[PDB]
Structure formats: structure tokens, C-alpha cells
């Protein structure tokens, strides 16, 4: 059937009776009233049963051996569905497929019923999810720590061509994967004040919110390792949230509990944008305060909570603990670690600071100013009084370090301050993370260089040893084996299965680049993929596309820096050229654009409306025929990505050079048989470097050119004046060609493009369409297109998150990865 494992006789029979046990005892249903949703749950519970045994021994193991622990703190974990992925990592897919088949059910139909775990916005949240999978696969004693939002990223609906947001009630029917652990509930404090008495400061008169943990198993790829992702949920204490007496109403007091619990109610839908709301800050401290108590409790036990030197010596803390900060969102972990050590454990400042800097590391994901977290001091002052004091003290000593290193450099002092003066005083969270971490890394080579040359130049000059790079990667399990079994199978037929956990082995596919059967096969799976997607389209969304055309797809969050607008300009150019010479041959294309816009991002929402508006015109022009279709992919999410990526021919990574830190979707497309058209930005550089620039469609300005233009001054009018085709498009938008009933509908886009384009769309226009003509030319030669595809796939090995994680482990965490199978799952009951 494929290498989805063995469909053993004993195990298919075992799976079937357990499926029936659950459908009866767990779901309390009988075959006669069972619906596909019930069947999905019976299966999910049956599959979950297979990893509890391994989950228990993995955790018991870490307790016995006591290795260095890796804590990955993140406010986002973009998990997606977990049924298939669990089957894949446990080599259960074929057995389950067989068993359900014999039960008379279609497994693929049941998989579609699982709701996505959309506790993420985009790139940052998915990275965390890919990292978790890789850390388990590399046998690291790693824990994912976050917030269990009851509402993840909103579900996007397109009404009248506009995005409509609606609550994502992903827990509506229940989550069979998580395990509530009310017994490990912890208290988290807010507000209060600081008392300075005799031997130390005291955080007093605080409001208490409880953090209840929920554990979800994270299985490694076929190694019997099942790590843990602990997600915190907010709960109100039943005392003060009722007991602070003297009138108000008993009923009201109980109803007001949903004020402390709102902390974990919903994820902020912002991607690469900072919003200074109090609720966000509370979420950020909530996850940090709860996680750290857990981290210290585990350390106090270790082997020190037995003997060792005997005396809670936190000197070994950094040898037993490593906490990675996914962006600055969990940055309060630094001053919180200091507060505990100094205020509670009573260590001297300097010893505590040494420990804190040695266990913390920070990962930066963007260079755009609006994405940077700068919290107003009055907010920190009211909500976290003691943390503000600790931050001021950290700033004081850090700045003394700078003054001592750069005597008389008074401007450098204000530039590096953690405290920003002006309208309102703010705390620069990024400066805080650099100061309190022993490592700071970028997510792609060029991004990491940009951090050193620009944004964090002063900090780099002070401590050059702190700055590193760790190019992002994606997990080949979910992004290859799970979503594209067809491609995984033909690769396995030639080079075996070891590449699934050793992606570098794909290089061996280079020797089949002239193999006639392989070229035919690679080309065949892509065609089968396109046919399946074209079908899904009519199934769930309804209104035909042509599977023979070039599948041009750009899927990512809607942003001005990602330039979906530059894509739009090309689409309109194609349309106008066809209308000018209707009976001339052009390579057919289906251009699909998908992605979500943050609710308050007006420009992003206006761009989604432009895309649909273009589709309204293009898709109904008889002269165009089937040569050009414009489709907006609704509700782009992880499970949707697993469907479009394997079906793409062209991947669009066209952000303005220097703005996309790394990008990971690009990697997903490369490993799945899509060719890439993009700018020398983010990881695109490393990908073209790996496959060879000849097998990549690079165009536009390089970082240097963008800077040259800024010195000069960007004037869009110039481009408008010298390019008739561009002029024609802007006048079409301006006059209502794409919006008849509301002719001035797109005035904000035209106005922006002409007068305030921060990402110089017009400057890359000419080179972009010229380059697009080149991919069309190559698509006309199926054999050469496929041969170039093989060159990309065979060279994508470097972009596996196993490689990224191995580097983090060795160069930052100080731990050694291991592909050693944990001692089976075998029963056991001590």
C-alpha cells in the first residue's frame, strides 16, 4: 500500500476490538447511531492508547537518568491535526487503514473530522511545532510550554469578497489528545505592591490566578520517545474570588470569576505586529510564572533533592536547565527568574544573574519596528511592580558595563538602554533578552547578519560571542511523509527509508536526475496531487479549476512586506496581455493566493478584497477561457497547507529583500516538488545556494539595492511614468475597472502604492514579470521542469528541523542529540 508500516495480522485484529471497546465504553454509542465523528473519536482514542505506555516510560526515564532539560517557552504552538501524525510516528498508519477498512470505514474521511489545534498565527507558531517533533525524534529531554487558548486563530470566512472572522471553538467536541492535570495547578500573582523589609523586598497584596496544566504527548519518529507539551489554563481561586467580602452580590462574585479566566481565553491574532494591551501582557507573565515554578520544582528533585553537595546550590542550575525564548513574548522569564532566586531563594544579585544569563537564550524572528515589543512602563508598574524594579536594576548594571567599555560614548548609552524615553517611557523587551541571555540567534543567515550590522549592532560590539545563527527548518514527517505519501514512496523505492530522519540523504536522488522512470514518477505524483486538490476544491468550496495549468501559489499571512500586492500586479498584467492578443498562446495558470489578515489590519483586509475582485473579473471573462483563473484560498491553516503544498508547481516567496527573517513555507514547497520564484531574502538565499541559482528563479533588488534606493529616496511616480503596463494597471484600479459599483473602493491601495510604499512594490515589478515569463517558458518543457524539480528536492535536506535542532542542542543548549530507540513501549506496571 505504501511504507506506512506493516499491516500485521495480530495488530489489525487488536486495533479493531479496541476501536469497538471505545465506541461502546468511551463514546457510549452503538453502531446503529454512530456517525463519522463518533468513528473518528473511537479511532483517536485507540491510537492514543498506543502512546501512553511510551509516554509514561519516557518521562519515568528522564526522572531516573536525570539529563539536562530543554524548556521551549512560546506563546504559540501551531500544531494542526494530530491523528495521522501520531500514526506516522508510531508506524501505525497501514494497520489502522486496514483495520478501519475491515470495519467498513474510510480512514481518510475520518481524519478530515479532526479539528486543527490552531494555537498559532503563522511562521513563529509552526516553527515551535516543528521543533517539538524534531526534539522528540532526536531524543532530547525537551518540554514545550505555552497557553491553552480555548479559542485559537479565528476561522476566516469570505463574504462579498471580504474576510469575516469567527471564533475558533476547537474544543467544542473535546480534545482526545490532552490530559488535564488539575493536581499540578499553580498560583500566579498580579498587581500588589513591593514592601522593602529588613532582609529583602516582598511582593505583597497580589491578586491570584491559578494555572492548571494540560499535557499533550509529542511522539518522536519511530524511536519510542514521547515528550510533553504542557499548556496552561487560567482558573480563578474559589476564595478571594468570592471571599473578599462586604457587599457586591454572591451571584455577581461567581460570574466575575470569568475575569481571571479570560487570560487563557483567546490567542491574539497578530502576526509580526505588536499590540500593547494589558490582556496580552498578562498572558505573557502567566505562562512565564507558571512554567518557571514547574522548572524549579523539577530541579529541586533531580538528584539534588536526594543528595549531591547538599544545600540547594543553584550553581548547577544551568547544567540541568536550558530555557529557550521563542521571540520576546516570554521575555519576563528573565526578571522572573531573578525575582525567585533573589527574593525567594535569597541568592546574592550577582550569583543569581550569572545563573539567569547561563540558562536563558533568545531567538529573534523579525527586524520590522512595528513587530518589536515595547511595553509602556506604567503598565509594568501597575501589573508587575517588582519586575519593573528588577528591570531597572538590570539596566543600571548593564549600562555601567557599556560605559566602562565605551568611555564617553553617551549616545550609545541611550541607544542601548532597556528603558526608552519619550512620549511615554517604554521597556524594550529585545534589549532585555540580549542582556539576560548567553545566546541570541537569527533564523536565517542573512537575517542573523542584519541583526549584527543593524538592529543590534551596539550589542554585538559589546558581546560578539552572544550572537549566532540557526537557519530554520521544517519536519520531514508532517511536511513530506504525512502530506505527500506518494512522493515519499517513490523516493523510498530508490534510496530507502532512512532519509525520513536523515534528510541529507535526499542528495542521493541527484543520481536519478537523468533516470527516465524517476522523472516520469516524480511528474506523476505531482499530477495525482493536483488532481486531488482540484477535486477537494469543488468538493468543499465549489466552482472548478483546470489541473493541467500551472499551479501558481502564494500562501502565508497577508502583509504589506510579503507583497501579495506585487503578485496581484502580475496577475492583472497577464489578464491585460491576454485581452490585447486573445488568440496568442500562453501557458495556462491557476494562481492561488491564501492567508489570513489580522482583524485590525485595514490594508491587509483591503488586499484580500482586491484579490477576490480580480477573480470576479478574470474568472468570468469568456475571452480568457481556462487560461487564467484567480482563486483565493479560504481559511488557510495547517491542515489546508498539507493539501495545497504537495499540489503546487510554483512557490511565491516575493517579500522585499531584508524583510522576511527566514520563512518556512518556502522550504515546504521545495521538498514537495515546487519550483521557487523569489527575492534574495530570508532562507531563499540558502535554498538557492543549496540547489544552485540555475535551478531557482531569483529576481529583484538585493538588500544592498534596497538601501541604495532609500539613500536616494524612493519615488513610485518614476516607475509609474516609465512603465506603460504598470500605468495601465493603476489607472484600472483608480477608475473602478475592478470595482464597478464602488469605483473609489481601492483608493487606499493606489494612494499607498504611489505615496507611502514602505516595501517598494513598483521597484521590483519589471524584474518580477520578466522572471515570471521565464518560468512559463520552462513549464512548456515538462521534462526539464521536472528535472529542475528533482534538483530542488534532492537538495532540500539542509532544511529539516532535525538539523536546526541538532545545532541548537550543540551550540546553545549544550546537549547531544541521539537517534537511539528508547527501550520499547512494553507493558510494565511497577
Ligand X SMILES: O=P([O-])([O-])F
Ligand Y SMILES: O=c1[nH]cnc2c1ncn2[C@@H]1O[C@H](COP(=O)(O)O)[C@@H](O)[C@H]1O
- Binding residues are 30, 63, 297-306
Cα gap 103→342, rounded to integer Å: 61
- The answer to the question of residue 18 lying near ligand X (CB under 6 A) is no
**Closest CA relative to residue 203, chosen from 29, 3, 30, 338:** 338
Got the DSSP string for 290-326?
HHHHHHHHHHHHTTTTT-TTSS--GGGHHHHEEEEEE
Q: What is the 8-class DSSP label of residue 627?
A: S
Which strands make up the sheet holding 650-653, listed edge to edge? 628-633, 589-594, 550-555, 650-653, 675-678, 697-698
DSSP at 526 = H
Alpha-carbon gap, residue 262 to 34, rounded angstroms: 35
Question: Is 356 noted as a catalytic residue in this protein?
Answer: no
Of the listed pieces 353-361, 390-398, 534-542, 656-664, which binds ligand X according to CB under 6 A?
656-664
Binding site for AMP, by residue number, is: 30, 63, 297-306
- Only one of the segments 7-15, 59-67, 561-569, 697-705 lies at the binding site for ligand Y (rule: CB under 6 A); that segment is 59-67
Q: Tell me, yes or no, if 664 is annotated catalytic.
A: yes
What residues contact 203, with CB distance under 8 A and at least 6 apart?
189, 192, 193, 194, 339, 343, 385, 386
Q: Of 30 and 721, which CB lies nearer to ligand Y in the complex structure?
A: 30
DSSP one-letter code for 455? T
Which one of 365, 387, 470, 627 is the catalytic residue? 365
Residue whose entry in the numeric block shows the C-alpha cell 490530559: 179
Least separation in angstroms between CB 216 and ligand GLC: 21
Grid cell locating 341:
532566586
- Pairwise CA distance, residues 675 & 652, whole Å: 9
Is residue 32 a contact point for ligand Y (CB under 6 A)? yes
Give the CA radius of gyration of the chain: 28
Binding-site partner at residue 556 among ligand GLC, ligand Y, ligand X, none, CB < 5 to 8 Å by type: ligand X
What's the min distance (Å) between Cβ of 63 and ligand Y?
Answer: 3
Bridge partners (DSSP) listed for residue 117: 80
Please tell me the count of residues contacting ligand Y according to CB under 6 A: 7
| Shortest spacing between CB 102 and a copy of itself, in angstroms | 15
Rounded (10°) angle between helices 724-735 and 747-755? 140
Which residues are CB-contacts of 779 (< 8 A; sequence separation ≥ 6)? 550, 587, 649, 785
**Binding-site member from 109, 244, 277, 777 for a copy of itself (CB under 8 A):** 277
What is the C-alpha separation between 148 and 22, in angstroms, rounded? 26
Min separation Cβ 53 and ligand Y, Å:
12
Q: How far is CA 447 from CA 371, 473, 684, in A?
A: 15, 15, 11
* For ligand X, the closer CB: 335 or 665: 665
The CA-based angle 178-478-824, given to 5 degrees, is: 65
Q: Which is nearer to ligand Y, 63 or 191 (CB)?
A: 63
Binding mask 90-129 for ligand X (x = CB under 6 A): --------------------------------xx------
660 binds ligand GLC (CB under 6 A): yes
Candidates 13-21, 315-323, 404-412, 658-666; binding stretch for ligand X (CB under 6 A): 658-666
Sorted by sequence, the CB contacts under 8 Å of residue 57 that are 6+ apart come out as: 224, 822, 823, 825, 828
30 vs 744, beta carbon nearer ligand Y: 30
Query: What are the residues whose beta carbons fall under 8 Å from the beta carbon of 65, sequence distance 6 or more?
Result: none
Quick one: cell of 515? Answer: 533516470
**What track of x and - describes contact with ligand Y for positions 314 through 343 (by CB under 6 A)?**
------------------------------
- Please, which residues have CB within 8 angstroms of residue 658's CB and are 6 or more apart in sequence? 367, 446, 450, 681, 703, 706
Instruction: Give min distance, CB of 445 to ligand GLC, in A.
Output: 13
36 binds, among ligand Y, a copy of itself, ligand GLC, none (CB under 5 to 8 A by kind): none
Task: Kindly state whether residue 123 participates in binding ligand GLC, applying the rule CB under 6 A.
Answer: yes
Question: Element (H or E) spanning 163, and its range?
Answer: strand 162-166
Kind of pairing between the strands at 117-119 and 77-80: antiparallel
Question: Cα dihedral sign for 482, 487, 490, 491?
Answer: negative
Give the number of other Cβ atoms within 10 Å of residue 30's Cβ. 10
Out of 92, 266, 525, 608, which residue is the one contacting a copy of itself (CB under 8 A)?
A: 266
Closer residue to a copy of itself (CB): 151 or 304: 151
Distance CA 825, CA 685 (A): 43
Q: How far apart are alpha carbons 67 and 663 in whole angstroms?
A: 32
530, 556, 563, 629: which one binds ligand X (CB under 6 A): 556
- Is 453 annotated as catalytic? no
- How far apart CA 19 and CA 42 sit, in angstroms, is 5
Query: Whose Cβ is closer to ligand Y: residue 10's or residue 64's?
Result: 64
- The one catalytic residue in 58, 664, 679, 804 is 664
Per CB under 8 A, the segment of 3-11, 170-178, 479-487, 502-510 that binds a copy of itself is: 170-178
| Phi, psi dihedral angles at 218 (to 5 degrees) | -120, 95
Residues in contact with a copy of itself, shown as a per-residue x/- string from 11 to 50 under the rule CB under 8 A: ---------x---xx--xxxxx--x-x-----------x-
Sole window of 53-61, 133-141, 629-637, 803-811 interacting with a copy of itself (rule: CB under 8 A):
53-61
Choose among ligand X, ligand GLC, ligand Y, none what residue 93 binds, the Cβ cut-off being 5 to 8 Å by kind: none
Query: Which of 89, 223, 227, 272 touches ligand GLC by CB under 6 A?
Result: 272
Smallest distance, ligand GLC to C-beta of residue 363, A: 8
Is residue 272 at the binding interface for ligand X, with CB under 6 A as the rule? Answer: no
Residue 127 binds ligand GLC (CB under 6 A): yes
Asked about 16 being catalytic, the answer comes back as no
Q: Which of 91, 180, 403, 587 binds a copy of itself (CB under 8 A)?
A: 180
Q: Is 365 helix (H, G, I), strand (E, B) or coil?
A: coil
Separation CA 646–CA 641 (nearest Å) = 8
Q: What is the DSSP letter of 367?
A: -
The answer to whether 590 contacts ligand GLC (rule: CB under 6 A) is no
CA angle 410-416-420, nearest 5°?
100
Query: Can you tell me which of 448, 666, 679, 684 binds ligand X, judged by CB under 6 A?
Result: 666
Considering CB distances under 5 to 8 angstroms, the limit depending on partner class, which of a copy of itself, ligand X, ligand GLC, none binds residue 576? none
Judged by beta carbon distances under 5 to 8 A according to partner kind, the member of a copy of itself, ligand Y, ligand GLC, none in contact with residue 123 is ligand GLC
829 near ligand Y, rule: CB under 6 A: no
Q: Mark residues 271-310: x for contact with ligand Y by CB under 6 A, - for none.
A: ---------------------------x------------
For residue 226, what is the enclosing H or E element? strand 226-235
- Comparing CB distances to a copy of itself, the nearer of 208 and 513 is 208
* Residue 298 interacts with, from a copy of itself, ligand Y, ligand X, none (CB under 5-8 Å by kind): ligand Y
Q: Which residues are catalytic?
A: 365, 556-557, 562, 664, 668
Give the binding site for ligand GLC (CB under 6 A): 122-124, 127, 272, 365-366, 443, 472, 660-664, 682
Residues that bind ligand X (CB under 6 A): 122-123, 556, 660, 663-666
Amino acid at each position: 500500500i505504501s511504507v506506512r508500516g506493516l499491516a500485521g495480522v495480530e495488530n489489525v485484529t487488536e486495533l479493531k476490538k479496541n476501536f469497538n471497546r471505545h465506541l461502546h465504553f468511551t463514546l457510549v454509542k452503538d453502531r446503529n447511531v454512530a456517525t463519522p465523528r463518533d468513528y473518528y473519536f473511537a479511532l483517536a482514542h485507540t491510537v492514543r492508547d498506543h502512546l501512553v505506555g511510551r509516554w509514561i516510560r519516557t518521562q519515568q526515564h528522564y526522572y531516573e537518568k536525570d539529563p539536562k532539560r530543554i524548556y521551549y517557552l512560546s506563546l504559540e504552538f501551531y500544531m494542526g491535526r494530530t491523528l495521522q501524525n501520531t500514526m506516522v510516528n508510531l508506524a501505525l498508519e497501514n494497520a489502522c487503514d486496514e483495520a478501519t477498512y475491515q470495519l467498513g470505514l474510510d480512514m481518510e474521511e475520518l481524519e478530515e473530522i479532526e479539528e486543527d489545534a490552531g494555537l498559532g498565527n503563522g511562521g513563529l507558531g509552526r516553527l515551535a511545532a516543528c521543533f517539538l517533533d524534531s526534539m522528540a525524534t532526536l531524543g532530547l529531554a525537551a518540554y514545550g510550554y505555552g497557553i491553552r487558548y480555548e479559542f485559537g486563530i479565528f476561522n476566516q470566512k469570505i463574504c462579498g469578497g471580504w474576510q469575516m472572522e469567527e471564533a475558533d471553538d476547537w474544543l467544542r467536541y473535546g480534545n482526545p489528545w490532552e490530559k488535564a492535570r488539575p493536581e499540578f495547578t499553580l498560583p500566579v500573582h498580579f498587581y500588589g505592591r513591593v514592601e522593602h523589609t529588613s532582609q529583602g523586598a516582598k511582593w505583597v497584596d497580589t491578586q491570584v490566578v491559578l494555572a492548571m496544566p494540560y499535557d499533550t504527548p509529542v511522539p518522536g519518529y519511530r524511536n519510542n520517545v514521547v515528550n510533553t507539551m504542557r499548556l496552561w489554563s487560567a482558573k480563578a481561586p474559589n476564595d478571594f474570588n468570592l471571599k473578599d467580602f462586604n457587599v457586591g452580590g454572591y451571584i455577581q462574585a461567581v460570574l466575575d470569576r470569568n475575569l481571571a479566566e479570560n487570560i487563557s481565553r483567546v490567542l491574539y491574532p497578530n502576526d509580526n505586529f505588536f499590540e500593547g494591551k494589558e490582556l496580552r501582557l498578562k498572558q505573557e507573565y502567566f505562562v512565564v510564572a507558571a512554567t518557571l515554578q514547574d522548572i524549579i520544582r523539577r530541579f529541586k528533585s533531580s538528584k539534588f533533592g536526594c543528595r549531591d553537595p547538599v544545600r540547594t546550590n543553584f550553581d548547577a542550575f544551568p547544567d540541568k536547565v536550558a530555557i529557550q525564548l521563542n521571540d520576546t513574548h516570554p521575555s519576563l522569564a528573565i526578571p522572573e527568574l531573578m525575582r525567585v532566586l533573589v527574593d525567594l531563594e535569597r541568592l546574592d544579585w550577582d550569583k543569581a544573574w550569572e545563573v539567569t544569563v547561563k540558562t536563558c537564550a533568545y531567538t529573534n524572528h523579525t527586524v520590522i519596528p512595528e513587530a518589536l515589543e515595547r511595553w509602556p512602563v506604567h503598565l509594568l508598574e501597575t501589573l508587575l511592580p517588582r519586575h519593573l524594579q528588577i528591570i531597572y536594576e538590570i539596566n543600571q548594571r548593564f549600562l555601567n558595563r557599556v560605559a566602562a567599555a565605551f568611555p564617553g560614548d553617551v549616545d550609545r548609552l541611550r541607544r542601548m538602554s532597556l528603558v526608552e524615553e519619550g512620549a511615554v517611557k517604554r521597556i524594550n523587551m529585545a534589549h532585555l533578552c540580549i542582556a539576560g541571555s548567553h545566546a541570541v540567534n537569527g533564523v536565517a543567515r542573512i537575517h542573523s547578519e542584519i541583526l549584527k550590522k543593524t538592529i543590534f549592532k551596539d550589542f554585538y560590539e559589546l558581546e560578539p560571542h552572544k550572537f549566532q545563527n540557526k537557519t530554520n527548518g521544517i519536519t520531514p514527517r508532517r511536511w513530506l511523509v504525512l502530506c505527500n505519501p506518494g512522493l515519499a514512496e517513490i523516493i523510498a523505492e530508490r534510496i530507502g527509508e532512512e532519509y525520513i530522519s536523515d534528510l541529507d540523504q535526499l542528495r542521493k536522488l541527484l543520481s536519478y536526475v537523468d533516470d527516465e522512470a524517476f522523472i516520469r514518477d516524480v511528474a506523476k505524483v505531482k499530477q495525482e496531487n493536483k488532481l486531488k486538490f482540484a477535486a477537494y476544491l469543488e468538493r468543499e468550496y465549489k466552482v472548478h479549476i483546470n489541473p493541467n495549468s500551472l499551479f501558481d501559489v502564494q500562501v502565508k499571512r497577508i502583509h504589506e512586506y510579503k507583497r501579495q500586492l506585487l503578485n496581484c500586479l502580475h496577475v492583472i498584467t497577464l489578464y491585460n496581455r491576454i485581452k490585447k492578443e486573445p488568440n496568442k498562446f500562453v501557458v495556462p495558470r491557476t494562481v492561488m493566493i491564501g492567508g489570513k489578515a489580522a482583524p485590525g489590519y485595514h490594508m491587509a483586509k483591503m488586499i484580500i478584497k482586491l484579490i477576490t475582485a480580480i477573480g470576479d473579473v478574470v474568472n468570468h471573462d469568456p475571452v480568457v477561457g481556462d487560461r487564467l483563473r484567480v482563486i483565493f484560498l479560504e481559511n488557510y491553516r495547517v491542515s489546508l497547507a498539507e493539501k495545497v503544498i504537495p499540489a503546487a508547481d510554483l512557490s511565491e516567496q516575493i517579500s522585499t529583500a531584508g524583510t522576511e527573517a527566514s520563512g518556512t513555507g518556502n522550504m515546504k514547497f521545495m521538498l514537495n516538488g515546487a519550483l521557487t520564484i523569489g527575492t534574495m531574502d530570508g532562507a531563499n538565499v540558502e535554498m538557492a545556494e543549496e540547489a544552485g541559482e540555475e535551478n531557482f528563479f531569483i529576481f529583484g533588488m538585493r538588500v544592498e539595492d534596497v538601501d541604495r534606493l532609500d539613500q536616494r529616496g524612493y519615488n513610485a511616480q518614476e516607475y509609474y511614468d516609465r512603465i506603460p503596463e504598470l500605468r495601465q494597471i493603476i489607472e484600472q484600479l483608480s477608475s473602478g475597472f475592478f470595482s464597478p459599483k464602488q469605483p473609489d473602493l481601492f483608493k487606499d491601495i493606489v494612494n499607498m502604492l504611489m505615496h507611502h510604499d514602505r516595501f517598494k512594490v513598483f521597484a521590483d515589478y519589471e524584474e518580477y514579470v520578466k522572471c515570471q515569463e521565464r518560468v512559463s517558458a520552462l513549464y512548456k518543457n515538462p521534462r526539464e521542469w521536472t528535472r529542475m524539480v528533482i534538483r530542488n528536492i534532492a537538495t532540500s535536506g539542509k532544511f529539516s528541523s532535525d538539523r536546526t535542532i541538532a545545532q541548537y542542542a550543540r551550540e546553545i543548549w549544550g546537549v547531544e542529540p541521539s537517534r537511539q530507540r528508547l527501550p520499547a513501549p512494553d507493558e510494565k506496571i511497577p
